[PDB]
Design a protein around this ligand. Structure first.
Ligand code: SF4
Lengths: 611, 325, 274, 527
């Protein structure tokens, strides 16, 4: 009898409008010891499908169908009966660690309560020993001391490690992991994957893990289900899937993943458009508005997930045309790295031995300084004309403050900054303001960087208006910029809240481009966008570099994008640049320990190299 | 804990030491006490004018006048009223009468308000939430002087309907208890019902709205879902994990809650005829009396600032983010 | 614009309360010249009569019509409410803005001075100055006095608003593209904070009316022969127990005004706050 | 409820046999101010309520009946007698058993000591009234131990008024040294000789308690104690609905309907000789010092609508009081109001002729606006008079500004000193009407708080007192009254209706009107 079996599960939420049908009749099975992955971008319905099985959806949700755990049905039970299965049989790991633990109890206490509430005979003085032992098993250092810590004394990695332990407490028969490694750095993410694998080994449980990337899936999972528009559209073993995906959607979702084995300048394969709204769908396949192989026959009735190969199923009727073909072929995208022009060897930014400190002080009403956080430690870096420099590091590594210190164009505490042959110390306001015309920045948050109540024309025109160009000409400039970044003429009147995330970042790019600069500072531009949208924006940045001859400061935490964009790389540790050089050398032959470790931590979407 | 509390005690001492100065200057500029004397018809001979100006200190400039006032007040001599009675003889009894009203009002009021707000936030948009939020709106929209009189009319009609004096509302105690102590306490409780209820309604209507907002913010956090995922029931999670976390914001607002109740007590003491500090404020302002009002602003500042330090102790005890870092 | 009015107009209670409040305000001035008896006209044949065919709401002990008296009371007590709320929001806006802009020591001195001003309850401070504003005909001094001690908590919200926005990103982006500071101010902060300063005004109206009517009830506010709803309630309460209308009509009008103001405040806040 | 509100010849108490009454209990009664002084012969302690306490506690010479007639109090004196008319002289005789609470025999010296104090011969005693102690040529002992002979160089028909009616006898101890008289009684009275004596005082809760005098030689009272409480206007009727107030007066239609509808309470009616008025400050520095302005203002106050408003539903057909010396229902009453009959147009003509031109809302001379300060006790009954006066004066252009003040020290701190321009209060008289003349209206009178007068009034007053036939004396008193009106001295407004609310179990207590209470007889009806 299957450990978990779901049949025709459906979920709908209610709002001032039509009810949004987040899940539309899925079914699947999980076995003891097995790992099943649910893969899909935002809006796809994975999280609703998780919380439906666990039974923790918001109260405004309706649920239908069947969910059976070890042979007992779970839907419709009162919480006094459901809570005999939560924790004791189903253990769950949640997405965001910043809010996941209650702030007024020590973490040892929060684990001890977890064991106590299903083993009431055990007694506090034994539960606390088990709690320390679990903090040891999950790999938190000095476990008996940290067992006394309150959640605000922990890092994000430590916090997520503490949730994994509240869950493997008892020995849950099934593990449900709801995007467990987002908002975590690559090294911590690798360690969390190690911890979860070890948890599966010690409990013997099955694992249902929910992700939006193929790297974790290739590394950790055994089977994969791909969700789109609230239904499973392809399923197979991960080897079979990666090598033989028979469905246009997966063809794309697996071609838009960046790769360390590709060379600079390689264009990715995006998927156009954006996902459907799950309130009132159109007839036929939900992928028809984006399907590159769409034919009117697929708009008469929604396709069904049907058998294609051994243990392999796909929900497309034209799959015979997908077999063996590359994503570039099916989408008709020329992915090749085009010939780079001979940009001059002159340097458009140079930073020499730059230093900065943030003081660390304690006390809220009055402040006592007790140490110095050396946020920027003697960094030396430079950017040639017409090229990309990639600055990479994890959270707190000082990459961001470095960039934004360069852009403020003011004299530093020590070291010196040069931009286009000008030193920021010989730069009075008449010169500083004129130099701002030559470098501008693109920010990571499209919700915050664009004025909430100003229309697109006003936003893209703002640099031009402020810099004093006339009303007759700025109109032409805006109309051309919207074309350049690929938006429609007819979007200028629309307000920012009416766009998708990808479109808003395209607006930001247009705005930054408004004066025709020679340097653009790209502050984590593509993080927190769906992978198929990331691919499109990466292609846009490359194409603009060849179209106009731009130069980029690119700063990011992930390295997979940087291999595609960057000609040179500088890697930062806690405010120090610890490797620097050509991208093919830094990524092909690292020699600093930290760099080799950071490169080793990157999840790779190819399962065949699991040695 | 005992670093944050010490640093905020020094702050409150300085706040009170400057509040007294600035409100003594405000009082001494706003009031002209010798006006009655200077407007008597067989106009008082100057000797009297100078003598009474001296006896009240009006012949000294403000800074020296206040220095002299504090020099005596720290020794317990709060001076004389405009009619020549000492202020110190009334002050102790007045403070007792006022604090016994404020304490019962605030204790019962905030406890009721916290419970009502938490219940509303847990049962959002259900009928009970709808009813309690509109009732809170009504009680917050009726001024204190309207509430007091409505309750008095109501009691009168009850007494007439039932046929006996069921509720008593004039003064703090009746003339005589006929021996025994159990009754000497009982009669005071009977008197205290309506005055303290008048304040408890205002406090409850404020704190229910504040607590409803705080609890709804807590329900937006993920840790409730984490708690239930361990095997807790919905109500044990809500109480043990949600409501304790929601209580922390309430500890910061209690100082301003008490500042509101100190104002309400002026009307309650006047309307129900209680001889406390609130009635003395009206008498002192009406007669242009500097010393009565100086004593009363010091009391009204001190009671608000002690609310602050009690709230500071409770916010440290509840929340660990100020206990340890 | 369209979205905020669509959000408010769906809030049936709030639009109804705003309508009622405006109709009361208009009526207080438009209606009196139509009535058979004015305020300050006494009918000595009809002392303490109940509502009827010649006194629409009856009379009080002096023979004054109670309808006309309350229209006059509404005039005075609602005008002071509006003016005090506007001026109080203005003072709060400027103090909060300058503090939340400068940061550092200037903010920590301006918020400490606000903290000092809140030390003794506002009503006490107002009532200490009231012997100087008593016995003058111009309501200007009472409005100034009530506004000067009402802005303090609003200053704190404004400080937040400014401190948060001063580090928002659209603000950052601006400096990086050559916009002058005056263009930043008329271009970004004004359109983005005005919508919440209006909530401040809407919420302060109720507190202003409460303060004025309480002060009038104690005999410290508006002086006869002028009237306020507080004056009318104070006059009627000594009679309410025997003849109820002279206290219930002014009191019901005052409570209705305050309920409408609070409904408008909460509903408008919910219309702006997503 | 409704009757005429004029002095009659009956009373309204539950007249019952004391023996049949309950043999114990206590009587609770209200006060408006904790007495600032207890010497009722001194202006500080000469107040109607302070005296109302004293009734049960000090001796009197004569008893006043319901029609105002007199009889000797055989419980204190054997036979007071008028021994000779022409060199007018009378003899008092204290009972052969009569003692003060300290043990001292009540003696001719006590009559003489009190007479000396209130003679006005020495200014050190700041007396409330000189009465006729200034007419007694001499006071001496007679043949018996206690016989007291009082000789008058000048005639005095009010000679029954000494130590009787509203007057009393005090021990010589507290009336012989100026120091004892002025400062000896700021806290509790001195010696006493009545059926009751004060035995507990409480300045903390503001209460006072009397208890029966164990030395008392009269009838054994049917009550043990009397308890007085200090309350404001709104504490008088609501607390009356409770067992707190045993009895209280009734001042407006609101108060009358509350007292009527509540249970266990009955309304009691007997109009007394007390009345209520505006008094004008005509002393140096007061804006009304000029009599022309006082007459001009007087013509602008309509007292008839004041009467109709103030006594609505308490009187059948309410009218103002139009006489100073005698109130309506007393013999000799007359209307002397004509000189200041309400006529605002001639008052406008007069204010023009006096140079107070119309400017803005109100009137001005030399840039000074015509504002009148009005001082009154803050109570619902008193505000109505003020508001009507303010309204009708606004119509002629005079601002009248209300100064509502609470009861504590009202007279001492404002009236006595003269901190007013117009003041509201009332006079509580008794069965001896001409006794008020030298006290109030003479230019040097002790109670002339407005300092108003002229020699014509003093001469007419003396001429009125210097006569031995009431029939003509009353006519001369009416001439005096007409002159007081012509001066613009003060404006009588209303005569007290005598409505009092009492707890229905009480007997031999209520509204007495002209009559005295027998303080031995009061008690509670057996259940
Ligand atoms: S079924 Fe047709 S429309 Fe749908 S994805 Fe396949 S080819 Fe495209």
């Amino acid at each position: 009898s299957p450990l978990l079996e779901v049949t025709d599960l459906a979920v709908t939420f209610r709002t001032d409008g039509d009810p949004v049908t987040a899940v539309r009749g899925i079914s699947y099975r999980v076995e003891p010891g097995e790992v099943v992955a649910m893969v899909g971008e935002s809006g796809s319905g994975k999280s609703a499908a998780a919380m439906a099985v666990v039974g923790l959806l918001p109260e405004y949700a309706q649920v239908r169908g069947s969910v059976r755990l070890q042979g007992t049905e779970l839907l419709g039970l009162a919480d006094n009966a459901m809570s005999r299965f939560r924790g004791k049989a189903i253990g769950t790991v949640f997405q965001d660690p910043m809010s996941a633990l209650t702030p007024v109890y020590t973490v040892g206490d929060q684990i001890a309560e977890a064991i106590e509430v299903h083993q009431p005979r055990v007694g506090k003085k034994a539960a606390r020993r088990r709690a320390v032992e679990l903090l040891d098993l999950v790999g938190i250092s000095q476990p008996q001391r940290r067992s006394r810590a309150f959640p605000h004394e922990l890092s994000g990695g430590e916090r997520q490690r503490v949730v994994i332990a509240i869950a493997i407490a008892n020995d849950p028969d099934l593990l449900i992991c709801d995007e467990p490694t987002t908002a975590l750095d690559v090294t911590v993410q690798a360690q969390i994957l190690d911890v979860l694998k070890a948890a599966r080994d010690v409990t013997g449980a099955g694992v249902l893990i929910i992700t939006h990337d193929l790297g974790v899936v290739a590394e950790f999972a055994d089977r994969a289900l791909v969700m789109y528009a609230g239904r499973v559209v392809e399923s197979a073993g991960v080897n079979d899937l990666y090598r033989d995906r028979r469905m246009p959607y997966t063809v794309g979702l697996l071609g838009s993943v960046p790769r360390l084995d590709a060379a600079q300048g390689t264009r990715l394969v995006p998927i156009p458009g954006a996902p459907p709204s799950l309130a009132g769908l159109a007839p036929g396949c939900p992928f028809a508005p984006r399907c590159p192989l769409v034919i009117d026959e697929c708009l008469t009735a929604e396709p069904e997930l049907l058998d294609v190969a051994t243990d392999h199923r796909a929900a497309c009727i034209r799959t015979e045309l997908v077999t063996g073909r590359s994503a570039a072929d099916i989408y008709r995208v020329k992915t090749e790295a085009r010939p780079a022009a001979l940009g001059d060897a002159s340097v458009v930014v140079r930073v020499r031995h730059l230093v900065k400190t943030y003081r660390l002080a304690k006390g809220v009403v009055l402040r006592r300084a007790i140490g110095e956080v050396r946020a920027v430690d003697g960094i030396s870096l430079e950017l040639r004309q017409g090229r990309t420099l990639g600055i990479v590091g994890e959270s707190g590594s000082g990459k961001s403050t470095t960039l934004h210190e360069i852009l403020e164009l003011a004299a530093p505490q020590s070291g010196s900054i040069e931009v286009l042959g000008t030193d920021v110390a010989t730069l009075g306001t008449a010169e500083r303001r004129s130099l701002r015309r030559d470098i501008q920045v693109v920010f990571q948050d499209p919700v915050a960087s664009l004025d909430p109540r100003l229309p697109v024309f006003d936003l893209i025109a703002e640099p031009l208006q402020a810099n004093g160009f006339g009303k007759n000409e700025t109109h032409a400039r805006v109309a051309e910029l919207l074309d350049i970044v690929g938006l429609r003429h007819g979007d200028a009147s629309r307000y920012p809240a009416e766009f998708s995330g990808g479109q808003k970042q395209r607006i930001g790019i247009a705005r930054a481009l408004a004066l025709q600069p020679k340097i653009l500072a790209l502050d984590e531009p593509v993080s927190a966008l769906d992978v198929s949208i990331q691919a499109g924006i990466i292609n846009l940045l490359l194409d603009l570099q060849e179209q106009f001859g731009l130069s980029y400061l690119f700063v990011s935490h992930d390295l997979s994008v940087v291999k595609h964009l960057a000609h040179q790389v500088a890697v930062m540790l806690a405010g120090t640049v610890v490797e620097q050089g050509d991208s093919e050398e830094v990524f092909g032959n690292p020699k600093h320990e930290y760099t080799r470790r950071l490169l080793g931590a990157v999840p790779q979407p190819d399962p065949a190299r699991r040695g | 804990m005992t670093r944050y509390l010490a640093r905020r005690l020094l702050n409150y001492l300085v706040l009170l030491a400057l509040a007294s100065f600035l409100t003594y200057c405000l009082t001494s500029l706003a009031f002209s006490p010798l006006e009655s004397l200077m407007q008597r018809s067989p106009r008082p001979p100057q000797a009297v004018i100078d003598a009474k100006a001296h006896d009240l200190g009006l012949d000294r400039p403000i800074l020296a006048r206040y220095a002299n006032w504090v020099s005596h007040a720290v020794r317990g001599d709060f001076g004389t009223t405009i009619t020549g009675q000492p202020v110190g003889t009334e002050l102790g009894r007045r403070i007792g009468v006022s604090l016994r009203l404020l304490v019962v009002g605030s204790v019962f009021g905030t406890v009721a308000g916290v419970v009502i707000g938490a219940w509303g936030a847990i049962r959002q948009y259900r009928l009970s939430d709808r009813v309690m939020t509109t009732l809170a709106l009504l009680v917050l929209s009726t001024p204190t002087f309207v509430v007091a009189n409505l309750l008095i009319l109501g009691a009168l009609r009850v007494n007439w309907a039932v046929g006996i004096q069921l509720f008593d509302y004039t003064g703090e105690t009746s003339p005589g208890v006929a021996g025994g102590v159990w009754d000497r306490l009982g009669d005071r409780l009977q008197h205290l019902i309506l005055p303290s209820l008048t304040l408890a309604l205002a406090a409850a209507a404020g704190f229910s709205r504040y607590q409803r907002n705080a609890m709804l913010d807590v329900l937006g956090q993920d840790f409730i879902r984490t708690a239930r995922a361990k095997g807790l029931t919905r109500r044990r999670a809500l109480l043990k994990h949600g409501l304790r976390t929601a209580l922390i914001p309430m500890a910061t607002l209690f100082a301003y809650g008490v500042a509101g109740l100190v104002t309400g007590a002026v009307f309650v003491e006047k309307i129900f005829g209680w001889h406390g500090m609130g009635e003395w404020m009206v008498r002192g302002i009406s007669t242009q009396d500097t010393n009565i009002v100086a004593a009363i602003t010091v009391f009204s500042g001190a009671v608000v600032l002690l609310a602050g330090l009690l709230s500071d102790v409770i916010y440290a005890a509840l929340d660990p983010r100020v206990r340890v870092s | 614009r369209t979205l905020v009015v669509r959000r408010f107009l769906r809030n049936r209670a709030a639009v109804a309360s705003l309508a009622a409040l405006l109709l009361l305000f208009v009526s207080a001035y438009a209606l009196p010249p139509l009535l058979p008896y004015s305020y300050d006209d006494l009918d000595f044949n009809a002392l303490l009569q109940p509502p009827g065919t010649k006194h629409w709401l009856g009379t009080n002990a002096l023979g004054q019509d109670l309808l006309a008296q309350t229209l006059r009371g509404m005039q005075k007590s609602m005008l002071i409410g509006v003016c005090v709320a506007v001026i109080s929001t203005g003072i709060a806006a400027t103090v909060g803005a300058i503090s939340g802009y400068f940061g550092g020591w200037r903010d920590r001195t301006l918020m400490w001075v606000v903290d000092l001003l809140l030390v003794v309850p506002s009503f006490i401070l107002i009532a200490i100055v009231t012997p100087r504003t008593k016995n003058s005909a111009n309501i200007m001094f009472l409005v100034l006095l009530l506004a000067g001690f009402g802005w303090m908590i609003s200053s704190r919200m404004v400080r937040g608003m400014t401190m948060s926005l001063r580090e928002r990103e659209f603000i950052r982006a601006a400096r990086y593209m050559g916009v002058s500071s005056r263009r930043i101010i008329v271009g970004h902060v004004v359109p983005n904070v005005a919508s919440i300063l209006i909530i401040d005004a809407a919420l302060n109206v109720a507190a202003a009316i409460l303060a004025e009517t309480g002060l009038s009830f104690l005999g410290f506010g508006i002086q006869p022969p002028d009237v306020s709803l507080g004056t009318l309630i104070a006059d009627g309460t000594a009679s309410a127990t025997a003849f109820p209308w002279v206290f219930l009509f002014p009191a019901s009008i005052l409570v209705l005004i305050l309920v409408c103001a609070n409904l408008t405040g909460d509903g408008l806040r919910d219309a702006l706050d997503p | 409820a409704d009757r005429r509100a004029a002095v009659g010849t009956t009373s309204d108490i539950n007249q019952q046999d004391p023996a049949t009454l309950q043999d114990g209990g206590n009587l609770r009664l209200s006060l408006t101010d904790f007495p600032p002084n207890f010497n009722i012969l001194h202006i500080d302690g000469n107040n109607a309520e302070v005296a109302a306490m004293m009734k049960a506690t000090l001796p009197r010479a004569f008893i006043i009946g319901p029609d105002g007639s007199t009889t000797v109090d055989t419980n204190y004196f054997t036979s007071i007698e008028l021994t000779r008319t022409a060199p007018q002289v009378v003899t008092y005789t204290i009972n052969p058993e009569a003692v003060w609470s300290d043990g001292t025999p009540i003696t001719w010296r006590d009559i003489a000591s009190q007479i000396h104090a209130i003679s006005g011969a020495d200014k050190a005693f700041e007396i409330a009234s000189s009465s006729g102690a200034e007419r007694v040529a001499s006071v001496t002992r007679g043949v018996d131990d206690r016989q007291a002979v009082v000789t008058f160089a000048k005639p005095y028909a009010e000679w029954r008024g000494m130590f009787a009616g509203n007057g009393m006898l005090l021990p010589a101890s507290m009336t012989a040294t100026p120091e004892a008289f002025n400062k000896g009684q700021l806290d509790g009275p001195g010696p006493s000789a009545g059926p009751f004596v004060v035995s507990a005082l409480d300045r903390t809760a503001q209460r006072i308690v009397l208890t029966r005098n164990p030395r008392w030689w009269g009838a054994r009272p049917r009550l043990d104690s009397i308890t007085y409480l200090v309350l404001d206007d709104a504490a008088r009727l609501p607390a009356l609905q409770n067992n707190t107030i045993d009895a209280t007066g009734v001042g407006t239609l609101d108060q009358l309907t509350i007292a009527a509808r509540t249970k266990g309470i009955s309304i009691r009616r007997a109009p007394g000789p007390s009345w209520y008025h505006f008094t004008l400050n005509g002393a140096p520095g007061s804006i009304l010092a000029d009599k022309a302005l006082r007459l001009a203002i007087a013509k602008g106050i309509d007292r008839y609508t004041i009467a109709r408003v103030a006594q609505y539903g308490l009187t059948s057909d309410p009218v103002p009081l139009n006489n100073h010396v005698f109130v309506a229902g007393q013999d000799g009453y007359q209307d002397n109001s004509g000189v200041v009959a309400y006529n605002p147009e001639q008052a406008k003509r007069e204010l023009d002729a006096l140079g107070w031109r119309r400017s803005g809302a109100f009137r001005e001379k030399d840039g000074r606006q015509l504002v009148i300060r009005d001082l009154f006790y803050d109570a619902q009954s008193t505000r109505q008079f003020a508001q009507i006066a303010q309204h009708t004066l606004a119509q002629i252009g005079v601002k009248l500004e209300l100064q509502a003040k609470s009861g504590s020290g009202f007279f001492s701190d404002y009236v006595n000193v003269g901190a007013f321009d117009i003041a509201q209060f009332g006079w509580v008289g008794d069965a001896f009407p001409l006794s008020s003349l030298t006290q109030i209206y003479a230019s040097d009178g002790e109670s002339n708080f407005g300092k108003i007068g002229s020699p014509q009034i003093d001469a007419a007053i003396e001429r009125t007192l210097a006569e031995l036939d009431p029939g003509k004396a009353r006519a001369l008193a009416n001439q005096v009254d007409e002159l007081i009106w012509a001066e613009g001295f003060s404006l009588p407004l209303t005569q007290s209706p005598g409505t009092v609310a009492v707890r229905s179990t009480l007997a031999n207590f209520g509204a007495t009107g002209l009559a005295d209470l027998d303080y031995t007889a009061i008690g509670f009806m057996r259940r």
